[PDB]
Design an enzyme around this catalytic site. Structure first.
Site, PDB file in Angstrom:
ATOM      1  CG  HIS B  41      14.997 -17.859   1.781  1.00 36.62           C
ATOM      2  ND1 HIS B  41      14.791 -17.615   3.120  1.00 36.62           N
ATOM      3  CD2 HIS B  41      16.018 -18.744   1.708  1.00 36.62           C
ATOM      4  CE1 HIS B  41      15.647 -18.330   3.828  1.00 36.62           C
ATOM      5  NE2 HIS B  41      16.379 -19.048   2.995  1.00 36.62           N
ATOM      6  N   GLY B 143      22.343 -23.421   5.781  1.00 39.28           N
ATOM      7  CA  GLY B 143      21.409 -24.520   5.624  1.00 39.28           C
ATOM      8  C   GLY B 143      20.454 -24.711   6.782  1.00 39.28           C
ATOM      9  CB  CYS B 145      16.595 -21.254   6.348  1.00 41.96           C
ATOM     10  SG  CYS B 145      17.637 -19.778   6.403  1.00 41.96           S
TER      11      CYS B 145
HETATM   12  C1  LIG Z   1      19.632 -20.987   5.338  1.00 44.63           C
HETATM   13  C2  LIG Z   1      19.101 -19.974   6.008  1.00 44.63           C
HETATM   14  C3  LIG Z   1      20.128 -18.879   6.244  1.00 44.63           C
HETATM   15  C4  LIG Z   1      20.478 -18.817   7.731  1.00 44.63           C
HETATM   16  C5  LIG Z   1      21.837 -18.190   7.979  1.00 44.63           C
HETATM   17  C6  LIG Z   1      22.993 -18.892   7.320  1.00 44.63           C
HETATM   18  C7  LIG Z   1      24.143 -18.747   8.306  1.00 44.63           C
HETATM   19  N1  LIG Z   1      23.483 -18.470   9.572  1.00 44.63           N
HETATM   20  C8  LIG Z   1      22.204 -18.156   9.445  1.00 44.63           C
HETATM   21  O1  LIG Z   1      21.489 -17.898  10.327  1.00 44.63           O
HETATM   22  N2  LIG Z   1      19.525 -17.621   5.839  1.00 44.63           N
HETATM   23  C9  LIG Z   1      20.094 -16.786   4.967  1.00 44.63           C
HETATM   24  O2  LIG Z   1      21.177 -17.019   4.459  1.00 44.63           O
HETATM   25  C10 LIG Z   1      19.330 -15.498   4.633  1.00 44.63           C
HETATM   26  C11 LIG Z   1      18.631 -15.618   3.269  1.00 44.63           C
HETATM   27  C12 LIG Z   1      17.377 -14.699   3.158  1.00 44.63           C
HETATM   28  C13 LIG Z   1      17.528 -13.327   3.845  1.00 44.63           C
HETATM   29  C14 LIG Z   1      16.986 -14.476   1.683  1.00 44.63           C
HETATM   30  N3  LIG Z   1      20.204 -14.343   4.581  1.00 44.63           N
HETATM   31  C15 LIG Z   1      20.811 -13.977   5.698  1.00 44.63           C
HETATM   32  O3  LIG Z   1      20.652 -14.603   6.714  1.00 44.63           O
HETATM   33  C16 LIG Z   1      21.708 -12.729   5.715  1.00 44.63           C
HETATM   34  C17 LIG Z   1      21.869 -11.807   4.694  1.00 44.63           C
HETATM   35  C18 LIG Z   1      22.757 -10.815   5.158  1.00 44.63           C
HETATM   36  C19 LIG Z   1      23.307  -9.642   4.576  1.00 44.63           C
HETATM   37  O4  LIG Z   1      22.906  -9.401   3.298  1.00 44.63           O
HETATM   38  C20 LIG Z   1      23.543  -8.345   2.620  1.00 44.63           C
HETATM   39  C21 LIG Z   1      24.185  -8.837   5.312  1.00 44.63           C
HETATM   40  C22 LIG Z   1      24.515  -9.208   6.623  1.00 44.63           C
HETATM   41  C23 LIG Z   1      23.974 -10.362   7.194  1.00 44.63           C
HETATM   42  C24 LIG Z   1      23.084 -11.175   6.445  1.00 44.63           C
HETATM   43  N4  LIG Z   1      22.430 -12.338   6.765  1.00 44.63           N
END
Ligand SMILES: C=C[C@H](C[C@@H]1CCNC1=O)NC(=O)[C@H](CC(C)C)NC(=O)c1cc2c(OC)cccc2[nH]1
Ligand SMILES: C=C[C@H](C[C@@H]1CCNC1=O)NC(=O)[C@H](CC(C)C)NC(=O)c1cc2c(OC)cccc2[nH]1
EC number: 3.4.19.12
Lengths: 303, 305
Positions: B41, B143, B145
């Site tokens: 992603h 950040g 991931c």
């Molecule tokens: C950088 C890497 C982050 C790890 C995150 C950042 C803060 N802490 C971490 O672990 N990964 C991401 O940002 C992922 C992105 C992919 C799924 C495309 N998306 C989510 O983690 C996320 C989407 C979401 C949602 O979508 C409507 C509703 C409710 C909770 C949700 N979480």
């Protein structure tokens, strides 16, 4: 989100660990530049351990009595001195992996990462707080002496702990890198007791803010307390008094959550007086006091 | 003495962490030999994440659209491919710090050390157990991931987790290093919920073996049970059933204490059916389930790497 006890990455320290042998005794040493630091009780025999006259034992040693191995390589000892409880072995080779470093003495309530080592090889990493009675609750087996505790700011490793002893109670004791013990302990083979341990109040409060920042609010209440009335109750329960400096250090967590420090003190007072009654906080059935305000801010700022 | 959650030394993995950027989106990747592994992603804009078509997003990308950096040092990308939810970027430099390694897919209950990283810079290390619902209770910020989880065997680093997402509940989800998610999750910016979690029976048993080794054995009863009967009972208390592999990896602790696995199962059954009263085990009124049988051996035997 999420709050977890986490240690600093140990790479910069792993590159400094070596094995130090004298006689039948092997433990760990810390190799920085052309000096290896290790506990001086490596020079003691089974009989010397009870009451060792270290200066008298050290003068009788030669450089060749110390074997230092960095991996497969043996490092030639070209000098040996003693700074309190730390033996210092000068070697003919500077450690190429020496990081930027400094030696610091940690205060009670502050945390640091321990790199537990055996035979000069890293085994594991975990956080420990310097308890008010100058012990730490670590995980150390035979041969772990010479393992070090540290913090990392930027790329500078601040070394603050070198491991020497396990007390009969199962807690642990050691020195700074100047060889001065934390606490009233001595590097002799004797059963030693620490002072009455107390709970690090400012850390308990930081951990409660962490629980709130992570969605746990069941322990909050609508009450507030003065600092002195809180400290009266705290000391009753063997908690350390809370100072205005502690209150200030908690400011950022207070601003993030909107909960004044003295409001959280009223929650802690209620917890100490009523207990948790089966409930848990961040998965713990007890009040945790090994998380500093900084450890909480580092993980929870922005959440 | 002392029982603590202990991460593996992280140096060997720190030397493999890099930064991967596509457009303005930056995350972490793992540099092993001449390949960098990262979440796919990274190729998605903020709006693309709501409903991405990764095959289509990737066809529009070229090697020259990927910025890989070890610190501020750029590693030229000379090839790219997608494997499930992991992007693989071939680079023109073999990582001289590459350790002996393998990629493994772990089971629920197994633990691993997470090296939390930001912009390719390691921030911290902590132990995580893969929950039965295929989440982990981590500590992750924006950040993060591409941060990985790993175990060390002798000197071989076994990578088993790459971080991708945080669920609304605050738990975390990710993939193995072949890009296959643990659990039913997808890499899409969508509210996803994990199944009901359960207690990891094999680790509770390990914790009980640890208690016995240390002289805390009040809970040992004079009964035994069949594996099937214990599994049926355990599920009523929200405990995971035991597999044959669970019984096998309890073998060493069973031999060390002389307490057959099924005898300990019968002891645990009574604790569930009667509770612990005001009594404690290893100082706790709660049963611990995030120490594996190997974690117990590690703590009580001092393994090095
Ligand atoms: C950088 C890497 C982050 C790890 C995150 C950042 C803060 N802490 C971490 O672990 N990964 C991401 O940002 C992922 C992105 C992919 C799924 C495309 N998306 C989510 O983690 C996320 C989407 C979401 C949602 O979508 C409507 C509703 C409710 C909770 C949700 N979480
Ligand atoms: C290798 C470094 C170990 C660390 C220990 C080993 C097990 N776990 C660890 O942490 N250090 C040592 O062995 C020290 C050595 C002294 C000369 C400073 N001695 C003790 O720790 C010790 C002696 C003793 C005792 O002696 C009468 C009675 C009751 C409790 C006791 N503890």
């Amino acid at each position: 989100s999420g709050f977890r006890k986490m240690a600093f990455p140990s790479g910069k320290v792993e590159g400094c660990m070596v094995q130090v042998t004298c006689g039948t005794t092997t433990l760990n040493g810390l190799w920085l530049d052309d000096v290896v630091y290790c506990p001086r009780h490596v020079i003691c025999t089974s009989e010397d351990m009870l009451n060792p006259n270290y200066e008298d034992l050290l003068i009788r040693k030669s450089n060749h009595n110390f074997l230092v191995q960095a991996g497969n390589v043996q490092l030639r000892v070209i000098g040996h001195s003693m700074q309190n409880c730390v033996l210092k072995l000068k070697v003919d080779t500077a450690n190429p992996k020496t990081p930027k470093y400094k030696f610091v003495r940690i205060q009670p309530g502050q945390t640091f990462s321990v790199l537990a080592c055996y035979n000069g090889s890293p085994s594991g990493v975990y956080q420990c707080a310097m308890r008010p009675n100058f012990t730490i609750k670590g995980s150390f087996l035979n041969g772990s002496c010479g393992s070090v505790g540290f913090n990392i700011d930027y790329d500078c490793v601040s070394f603050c702990y070198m491991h020497h002893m396990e007390l009969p109670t199962g807690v642990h004791a050691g020195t700074d890198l100047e060889g001065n013990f934390y606490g009233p302990f001595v590097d002799r083979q004797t059963a030693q007791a620490a002072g009455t341990d107390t709970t690090i109040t400012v850390n308990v409060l930081a951990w409660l803010y962490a629980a709130v920042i992570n969605g746990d609010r069941w322990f909050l209440n609508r009450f507030t307390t003065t600092l002195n009335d809180f400290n009266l109750v705290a000391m009753k329960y063997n908690y350390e008094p809370l100072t205005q400096d502690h209150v200030d250090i908690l400011g950022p967590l207070s601003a993030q959550t909107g909960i004044a420090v003295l409001d959280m003190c009223a929650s802690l007072k209620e917890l100490l007086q009523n207990g948790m009654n089966g409930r848990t906080i961040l998965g713990s059935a007890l009040l945790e006091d090994e998380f500093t305000p900084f450890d909480v801010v580092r993980q929870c700022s922005g959440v």
